[PDB]
Amino acid sequence: IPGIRAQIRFIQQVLEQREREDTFRLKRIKGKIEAREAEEE
Amino acid sequence: KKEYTGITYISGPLLFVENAKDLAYGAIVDIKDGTGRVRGGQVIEVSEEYAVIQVFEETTGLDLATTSVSLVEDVARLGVSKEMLGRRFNGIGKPIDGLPPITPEKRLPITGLPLNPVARRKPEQFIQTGISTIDVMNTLVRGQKLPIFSGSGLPANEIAAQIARQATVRPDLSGEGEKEEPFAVVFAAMGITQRELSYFIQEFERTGALSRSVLFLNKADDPTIERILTPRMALTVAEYLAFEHDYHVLVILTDMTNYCEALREIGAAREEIPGRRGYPGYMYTDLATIYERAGVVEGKKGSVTQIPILSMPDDDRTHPIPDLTGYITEGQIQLSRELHRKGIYPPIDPLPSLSRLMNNGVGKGKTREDHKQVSDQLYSAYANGVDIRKLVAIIGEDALTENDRRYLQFADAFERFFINQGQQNRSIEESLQIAWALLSMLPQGELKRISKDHIGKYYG
Amino acid sequence: KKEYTGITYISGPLLFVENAKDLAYGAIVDIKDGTGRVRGGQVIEVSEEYAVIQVFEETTGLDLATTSVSLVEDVARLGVSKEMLGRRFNGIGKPIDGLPPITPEKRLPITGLPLNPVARRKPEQFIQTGISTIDVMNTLVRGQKLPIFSGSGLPANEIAAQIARQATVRPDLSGEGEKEEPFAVVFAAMGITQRELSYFIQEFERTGALSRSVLFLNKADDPTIERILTPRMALTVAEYLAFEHDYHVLVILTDMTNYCEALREIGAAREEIPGRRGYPGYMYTDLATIYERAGVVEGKKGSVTQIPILSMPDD
Amino acid sequence: NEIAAQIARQATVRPDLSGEGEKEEPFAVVFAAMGITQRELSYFIQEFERTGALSRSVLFLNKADDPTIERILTPRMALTVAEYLAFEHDYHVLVILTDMTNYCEALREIGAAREEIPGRRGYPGYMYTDLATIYERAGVVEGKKGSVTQIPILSMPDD
Amino acid sequence: MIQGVIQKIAGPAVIAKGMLGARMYDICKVGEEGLVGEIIRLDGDTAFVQVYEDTSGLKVGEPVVSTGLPLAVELGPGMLNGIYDGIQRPLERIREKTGIYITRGVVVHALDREKKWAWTPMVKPGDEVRGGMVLGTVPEFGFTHKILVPPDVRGRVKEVKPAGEYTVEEPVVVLEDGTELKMYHTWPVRRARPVQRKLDPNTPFLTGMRILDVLFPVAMGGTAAIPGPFGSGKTVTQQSLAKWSNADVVVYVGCGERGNEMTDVLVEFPELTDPKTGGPLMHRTVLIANTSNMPVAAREASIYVGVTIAEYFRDQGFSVALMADSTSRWAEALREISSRLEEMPAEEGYPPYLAARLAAFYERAGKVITLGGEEGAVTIVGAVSPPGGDMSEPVTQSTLRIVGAFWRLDASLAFRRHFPAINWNGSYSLFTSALDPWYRENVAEDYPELRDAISELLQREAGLQEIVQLVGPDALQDAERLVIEVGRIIREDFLQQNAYHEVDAYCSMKKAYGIMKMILAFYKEAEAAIKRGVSIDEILQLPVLERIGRARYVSEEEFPAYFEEAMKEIQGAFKAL
Amino acid sequence: PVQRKLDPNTPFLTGMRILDVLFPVAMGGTAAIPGPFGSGKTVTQQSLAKWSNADVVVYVGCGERGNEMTDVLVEFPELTDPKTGGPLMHRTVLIANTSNMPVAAREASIYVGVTIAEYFRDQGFSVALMADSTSRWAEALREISSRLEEMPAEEGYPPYLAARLAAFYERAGKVITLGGEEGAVTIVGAVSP
Amino acid sequence: PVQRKLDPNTPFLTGMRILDVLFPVAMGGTAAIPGPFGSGKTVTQQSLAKWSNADVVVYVGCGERGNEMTDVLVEFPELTDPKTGGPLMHRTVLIANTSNMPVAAREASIYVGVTIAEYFRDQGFSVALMADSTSRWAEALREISSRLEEMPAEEGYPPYLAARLAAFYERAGKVITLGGEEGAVTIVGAVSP
Numbered sequence A: 001i002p003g004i005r006a007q008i009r010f011i012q013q014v015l016e017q018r019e020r021e022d023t024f025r026l027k028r029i030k031g032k033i034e035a036r037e038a039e040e041e
Numbered sequence B: 001k002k003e004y005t006g007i008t009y010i011s012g013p014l015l016f017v018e019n020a021k022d023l024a025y026g027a028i029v030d031i032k033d034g035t036g037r038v039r040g041g042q043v044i045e046v047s048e049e050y051a052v053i054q055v056f057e058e059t060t061g062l063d064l065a066t067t068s069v070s071l072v073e074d075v076a077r078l079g080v081s082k083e084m085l086g087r088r089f090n091g092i093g094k095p096i097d098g099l100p101p102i103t104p105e106k107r108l109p110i111t112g113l114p115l116n117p118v119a120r121r122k123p124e125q126f127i128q129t130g131i132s133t134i135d136v137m138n139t140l141v142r143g144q145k146l147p148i149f150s151g152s153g154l155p156a157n158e159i160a161a162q163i164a165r166q167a168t169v170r171p172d173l174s175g176e177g178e179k180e181e182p183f184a185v186v187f188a189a190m191g192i193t194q195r196e197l198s199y200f201i202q203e204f205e206r207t208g209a210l211s212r213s214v215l216f217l218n219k220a221d222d223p224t225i226e227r228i229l230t231p232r233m234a235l236t237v238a239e240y241l242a243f244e245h246d247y248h249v250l251v252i253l254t255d256m257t258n259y260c261e262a263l264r265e266i267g268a269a270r271e272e273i274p275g276r277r278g279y280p281g282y283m284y285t286d287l288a289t290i291y292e293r294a295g296v297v298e299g300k301k302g303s304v305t306q307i308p309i310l311s312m313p314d315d316d317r318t319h320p321i322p323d324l325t326g327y328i329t330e331g332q333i334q335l336s337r338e339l340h341r342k343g344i345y346p347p348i349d350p351l352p353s354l355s356r357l358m359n360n361g362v363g364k365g366k367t368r369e370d371h372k373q374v375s376d377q378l379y380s381a382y383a384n385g386v387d388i389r390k391l392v393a394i395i396g397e398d399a400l401t402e403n404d405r406r407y408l409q410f411a412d413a414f415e416r417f418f419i420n421q422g423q424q425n426r427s428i429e430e431s432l433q434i435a436w437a438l439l440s441m442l443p444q445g446e447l448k449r450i451s452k453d454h455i456g457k458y459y460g
Numbered sequence C: 001k002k003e004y005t006g007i008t009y010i011s012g013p014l015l016f017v018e019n020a021k022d023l024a025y026g027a028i029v030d031i032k033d034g035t036g037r038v039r040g041g042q043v044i045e046v047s048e049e050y051a052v053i054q055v056f057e058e059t060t061g062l063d064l065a066t067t068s069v070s071l072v073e074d075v076a077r078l079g080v081s082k083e084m085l086g087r088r089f090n091g092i093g094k095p096i097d098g099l100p101p102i103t104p105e106k107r108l109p110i111t112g113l114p115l116n117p118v119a120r121r122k123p124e125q126f127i128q129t130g131i132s133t134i135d136v137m138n139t140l141v142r143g144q145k146l147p148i149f150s151g152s153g154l155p156a157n158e159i160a161a162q163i164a165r166q167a168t169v170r171p172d173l174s175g176e177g178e179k180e181e182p183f184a185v186v187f188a189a190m191g192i193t194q195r196e197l198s199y200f201i202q203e204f205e206r207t208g209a210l211s212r213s214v215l216f217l218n219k220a221d222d223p224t225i226e227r228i229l230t231p232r233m234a235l236t237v238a239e240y241l242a243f244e245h246d247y248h249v250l251v252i253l254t255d256m257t258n259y260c261e262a263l264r265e266i267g268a269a270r271e272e273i274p275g276r277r278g279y280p281g282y283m284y285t286d287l288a289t290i291y292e293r294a295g296v297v298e299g300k301k302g303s304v305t306q307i308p309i310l311s312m313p314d315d
Numbered sequence D: 001n002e003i004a005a006q007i008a009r010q011a012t013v014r015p016d017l018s019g020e021g022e023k024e025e026p027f028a029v030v031f032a033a034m035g036i037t038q039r040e041l042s043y044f045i046q047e048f049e050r051t052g053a054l055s056r057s058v059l060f061l062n063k064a065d066d067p068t069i070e071r072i073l074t075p076r077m078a079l080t081v082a083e084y085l086a087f088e089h090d091y092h093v094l095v096i097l098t099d100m101t102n103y104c105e106a107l108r109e110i111g112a113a114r115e116e117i118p119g120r121r122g123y124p125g126y127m128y129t130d131l132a133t134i135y136e137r138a139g140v141v142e143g144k145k146g147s148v149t150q151i152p153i154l155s156m157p158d159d
Numbered sequence E: 001m002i003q004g005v006i007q008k009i010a011g012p013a014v015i016a017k018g019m020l021g022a023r024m025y026d027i028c029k030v031g032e033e034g035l036v037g038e039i040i041r042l043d044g045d046t047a048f049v050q051v052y053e054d055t056s057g058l059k060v061g062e063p064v065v066s067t068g069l070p071l072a073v074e075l076g077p078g079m080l081n082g083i084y085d086g087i088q089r090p091l092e093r094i095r096e097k098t099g100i101y102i103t104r105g106v107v108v109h110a111l112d113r114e115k116k117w118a119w120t121p122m123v124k125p126g127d128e129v130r131g132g133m134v135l136g137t138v139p140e141f142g143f144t145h146k147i148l149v150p151p152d153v154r155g156r157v158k159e160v161k162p163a164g165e166y167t168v169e170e171p172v173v174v175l176e177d178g179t180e181l182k183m184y185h186t187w188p189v190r191r192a193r194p195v196q197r198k199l200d201p202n203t204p205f206l207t208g209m210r211i212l213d214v215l216f217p218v219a220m221g222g223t224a225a226i227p228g229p230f231g232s233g234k235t236v237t238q239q240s241l242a243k244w245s246n247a248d249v250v251v252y253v254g255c256g257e258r259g260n261e262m263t264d265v266l267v268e269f270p271e272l273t274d275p276k277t278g279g280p281l282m283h284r285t286v287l288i289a290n291t292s293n294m295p296v297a298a299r300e301a302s303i304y305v306g307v308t309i310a311e312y313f314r315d316q317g318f319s320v321a322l323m324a325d326s327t328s329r330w331a332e333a334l335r336e337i338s339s340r341l342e343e344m345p346a347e348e349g350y351p352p353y354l355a356a357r358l359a360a361f362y363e364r365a366g367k368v369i370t371l372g373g374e375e376g377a378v379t380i381v382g383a384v385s386p387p388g389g390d391m392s393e394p395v396t397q398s399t400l401r402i403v404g405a406f407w408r409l410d411a412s413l414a415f416r417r418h419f420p421a422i423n424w425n426g427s428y429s430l431f432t433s434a435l436d437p438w439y440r441e442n443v444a445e446d447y448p449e450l451r452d453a454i455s456e457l458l459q460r461e462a463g464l465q466e467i468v469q470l471v472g473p474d475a476l477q478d479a480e481r482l483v484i485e486v487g488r489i490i491r492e493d494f495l496q497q498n499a500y501h502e503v504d505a506y507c508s509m510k511k512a513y514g515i516m517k518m519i520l521a522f523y524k525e526a527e528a529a530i531k532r533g534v535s536i537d538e539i540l541q542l543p544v545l546e547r548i549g550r551a552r553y554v555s556e557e558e559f560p561a562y563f564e565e566a567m568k569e570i571q572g573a574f575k576a577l
Numbered sequence F, G: 001p002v003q004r005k006l007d008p009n010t011p012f013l014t015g016m017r018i019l020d021v022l023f024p025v026a027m028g029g030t031a032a033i034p035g036p037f038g039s040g041k042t043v044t045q046q047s048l049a050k051w052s053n054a055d056v057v058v059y060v061g062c063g064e065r066g067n068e069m070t071d072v073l074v075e076f077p078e079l080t081d082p083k084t085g086g087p088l089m090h091r092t093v094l095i096a097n098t099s100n101m102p103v104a105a106r107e108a109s110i111y112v113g114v115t116i117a118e119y120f121r122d123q124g125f126s127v128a129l130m131a132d133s134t135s136r137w138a139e140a141l142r143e144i145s146s147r148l149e150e151m152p153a154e155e156g157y158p159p160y161l162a163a164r165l166a167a168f169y170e171r172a173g174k175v176i177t178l179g180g181e182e183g184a185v186t187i188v189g190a191v192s193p
């Protein structure tokens, strides 16, 4: 029981890690597009 | 009318329109190509410079030169009437039955105004379904919403069809019930196979459901924004009927997961950051927007009952769609690949199925005397019968006593006669007497959650 | 005196000051709303076009007209005296006793400097605590740091208020010198329920360790900048009273998890990439700041011994 | 490295059971290395001089201490010569593309310098097309008795 | 005041032009309809209004005006018997005015403004007032009401009105500093009404059910938590500790939930009986209520509205129980209002400042003395409903870190018919020591020892029941059978309250201590009997156990005529045998 | 444009045991077959293409390896039609786009396979389209949407992906054509996660 | 730069029992020591600094305690290497970088250490190098790449960290210098995952 809880919790946290990376990257690319709307003039 | 030409930046499903500071936010436009063809679109993101038109269909015949856009119906509404009770539509609300399009009695906004909660009494009179394992163990009452957590490979749509064509309120258990009230079934289906749409029109037109059931069927190849707008149309028709003529309206929303994916696609299209697992952060309130428009009303007589059906992706309940639906609605019923591949229609195992409003809804005067006792007794009896059934693979049938042999024969006969129904039209009294015939297989005195007088008054 | 105005853009806890060139990176300002209330702020990201003031408190009712910004004390200094033994302070360090404010004796910066490692001796002498497994199997050598791990529903607060009072160094198990080295406990409460604050007040006043201790209680309904600033206040007063009076100060950092949620709460301002599970990746440098500030120095009899108690978020 | 060395030194097509007589031509090794360190390099070249294969082989060495972007050019430059020696001289070219993980890390670096949206675990989307245009320049053609057989060596990260 | 116009509308984010010099976080009526936005993220001239409601059908170049005040609440008389939304708009007058839906872009006031209350003055011209002092009483429902000067205001009082039958828009007094003072006043919701000092808990919040003050005290000025599953009856417990509390003012906050799980609150709570004076309980209970389809920031600031109204009642020297409902729903509201702000997420999906916001919620609750200088206490019985059911989620984690009394409710005990559903093997208090001198001085000098004994028994019973679970509860030995029977009668008698009983609705400390001493005397009398020479089962059939089983149903006004009588009766009943 | 669509009463007689008995495909219906690498997708599809009851088989290789395609081109004309006696390639129009072949051609290939199958269902035949690796078409959408500087949906596909996939799987369905006669397209789509 | 690199044939006698009985390191070879907190790591580094057969030990500790550095500087000038006599401190150049010192200096520090290692391998000395806690050097790379606003990949570590780390470890080996001496430099890299 506890080893399987530790494995499932570890997989949950590494998927949360992947999700934080990708929402960071999408925040960055929205910053890019707003910056490009500024860049055009 | 005026036509806003001089448009730049067509991109994907979007296009920009210069100097159109007259389009209000959320305005329906029609995009007339230079080649005489008209698409539909919705206006977002108006500015002083440019407005944004999202296009329903794919942008293919457009160009920077020969493009015009025209405002139509500056906030999206529909024309509503009562005569439309046999009329198929598709999302927008175009008739697709090849029959004369109706004239409005009213002109209602398709978005929902929320209910003042002080004008809602508690829902406490039942509605049968025909499905005995719904109407015995975990009932449905007028006003409640309860979803069907269907599997990804199970026959949900046949269940939607049968419950839509069979469920009728019965007032003769109440206080001298009249049948002057009609019963309107509003049936919305979104993101659907062509084959199962033909199945639905066959099933509705075969048993006279078509006389009293209005239909919003739109397909998968239809634009996704029509799948967003469709249950708005269904619920505003339901609200019009039930609260402007005091009807009893049962609404069935097929495949809320398709609504979810259309919401996620349009969020990522209209350029905003997704939240949990790539879903939009406003999915909870937008999902409450089309759940919490149901109920019963203090003073009025209407009753909006809401059965949504959602396909869980690969059978988890901490996926965001069943998490929000089980976190908003009142209970759930749940199908199972186990019992369906064993072979039983309908495939409802009840042991994770639960209403949270049966306690207020059933009882003497309302439906029947013994109803909750029968429900709890059958729940606990089938609960330990399942575990005895999986234990007996180890122990050996002779090595268990008389009483648990009776429990195992109870489970074996139970899943054959009570649940296994197919198309067998059952009402509530046959449901109770088959419940007592199944409970006769247990010996008396074992029925610890049923008081003695019901045993003496119903045993067989 | 020297009031910048001209606020172009206030977004969250951040605002942009036009025409700012005389300011400095890492300096402190006060923001003065027109109604008459100041707020602390920090000067980061200094450009020729504008300068980015991080607001410390919640922003409310600020404008772009009357937002008077003024530079206040370039290095993050603090007025520290000797006779702070036994007074409740703020998370900032302002007094909450009814007593008058202290005269300063050295306005030294609260960040501190790294010790030169060719000036540190080894931790080589002993201090007595109360707890027997901390005294025998574990051993609290004077001059190091050691944490107490704990759990969610476990009594660590009583162990804190216990080792704050039944722990004094034994000088006659070694040779002699027993008058000249008294004892002191700096007690920083990073994030507290009010009930805990009542418990610590009653226990310290009961045992009389308030005549030796110094109190940096958080009162954790205050804005998060006071939570993040109280450990450096505590260790600054500890380093002054340990390297200018040759004491042997034991320091209790109370919870450290309210600290780390304060750090992950201010960290989501610059949109820096979060690390493992939302903790911003420079956290190791910040804990290295507020841990390796302690240690022993040759030539002095000073020692700063750190006990950070931290619970796990889960076990 | 030792498995690749043994298949380099002692692999031979057997003509007799195929039923065509014989021509029994031995192989020709295109050994392209992308960030092998020094020890593997020593082992491969001493293995090749002990089996005597360096009179019929070519090495495109792009070591660990070499710069880190020319790894994108190394396999395509090797397989150009492989296509050449197969399809113009009727050979039996075997190509050892060592340690593709360093190729993929260099591809990740050039994909992340240009901000490009990656797929899974930070690798960019066009990695499929670039590993395709490395791999599928291999096979046999109709009529021409030249041929290319590849061993790419992967290093699975978390095995 | 500041009339600007709109230059951009993107969803609910309306970017407005012309409001240079406008403040931060104000009301900002939008358009000819007028929607209540809030002002974030200023930039040069512009201001980013976030609109609470759907922006369907607004155009560019439409006028937008501000108020200047932050998100406030209004305070005065007539607030009792009140039902509100999250931004304090009384839904009874809204269904009265504009139909059974809620039309977007409508405005009413919180107070009624058209009821002449009966003023009674209490200060004289020539006095001066500091903030927090009363200056006039109003009787509302026979509950006394005290109009305070709003805080951070001072001045010498003149133009004092005599005993007049007035409305809320008549300034009863003026200062000599300008500054008229009316009955109502407004207050910014995101901080506390400042008060001169708080206290430490030396008073037990008399819930009234005979477990959740005895074994699990909560200590008025304190803070509790209950996770509430379906199948346990949370609602009857909330009605019970709203009906039988020590606290004289209840603030119920439904911070967004299921609508049909809130219509029972709407149609059951005004037909309770206030069991002190006689009327319904609504004459002393403010009620905030939200569905799940209301505007989002209303659902967010709902509990701040509740806390600020409860502080307005604590500064009148009262005893407020604030019961909040389903804090995870409030976390969902905060999460959604975070995703509009494009914030970088946290552990599960939450904002980074969730622990800070729950700290600012819970720590605005304690036994406190007013600026007028008298005692009142605003304690919180706030709930939690786990969506996943797993207790590792950060909302239950931070709640279990911050609160001082954590209870549990089970689906198993109500399935076994145990009302209430409190588990005593997974719940915990922390208010034992701070209530220890009060218990010694006002209950008896052995009540902490006796609750130590019963806590030992309820540890011991589940500590030993594994061989009972396996072997069989007949063939044990002759001390452990007495422990099983004592713990079973502890369960079935000391724990089990039928709240719908007429006299068992309430349990003051002397009745609990009496039943408590009776059952310990039975234990250490029967243990003497079984340790001298006899077995257990002949003791188990006896009119003693009948008297303990009736001992909870005896009224407290036969209790001195029951307690020592049954004490000596058990004494002689085992002295004879 | 087709006259009318129907409900199917005719199976796709596969040729394999499980994929006809326990998991049937009706002749108008579609079918998806996901599988990890090294599992037997291509051999399954070639078993279908060798032994189905189709008048015409459109075989769409969208982003695959070349030896799969040349194996088919060598191996079919040496064999026997199940329906007629002809060489098996005479019932197969093959559309190929292997992995080294250029990147944006994949959307073109996957629409061209279904439109040639739609031409042959307008002749009253009964057509089997085995299209594999529509994941590679989603990945080509990732390719070109990555250079537009757009905001991708979940994991990196541009967000009109499922709209395109629904529009692709629309076109089957046992339909009565314009010239009175009836015909059918069936689709066997491989998805590679 | 060197004339030529040799092959490792002579063991770096690490001194401890398990580290040469079971899993030995050669004289030009490199070793990696993982291990979380509470698993020593510093007892082991100081033991390798005390008892080996090096000629110069370059102990480069980055992102590290101060007590370790002052431990090494206190207890070395009394203990004695097995070969010479005199203090051990006269063969150990140590580059401290305590974790409170400013974060950008670490990437200077590591290359300073390996440069000193090459200057001593050019003088006939079998140099032992101990690069302690290079995960903090990876944090330094993460901090400056996040200061400089590039793309992060795999938890913020910038994607050229493998190139930096490979060009670091590849400086070790067994060479013969241009003067005619032989030499070898070995690296013990302590990684703290």
Ligand SMILES: Nc1ncnc2c1ncn2[C@@H]1O[C@H](COP(=O)(O)OP(=O)(O)O)[C@@H](O)[C@H]1O
Binding pocket: F035, F036, F037, F038, F039, F040, F041, F042, F043, F044
């Ligand atoms: N019916 C079968 N009989 C024998 N071998 C098979 C059969 N089906 C598949 N295989 C083997 O399975 C392997 C998988 O081929 P492939 O279709 O490329 O896998 P996938 O496409 O699922 O990655 C093939 O090499 C083939 O030899």
Ligand SMILES: Nc1ncnc2c1ncn2[C@@H]1O[C@H](COP(=O)(O)OP(=O)(O)O)[C@@H](O)[C@H]1O
Binding pocket: D113, D114, D115, D116, D117, F146, F147, F148, F149
């Ligand atoms: N700073 C940069 N310099 C060069 N290329 C970049 C840069 N940042 C991103 N890129 C990549 O180069 C591409 C540039 O796209 P863009 O200039 O919008 O259109 P085009 O594809 O015509 O160059 C993007 O797909 C992006 O992935």
Ligand SMILES: [Mg+2]
Binding pocket: F037, F038, F041, F042, F192
């Ligand atoms: Mg495959």
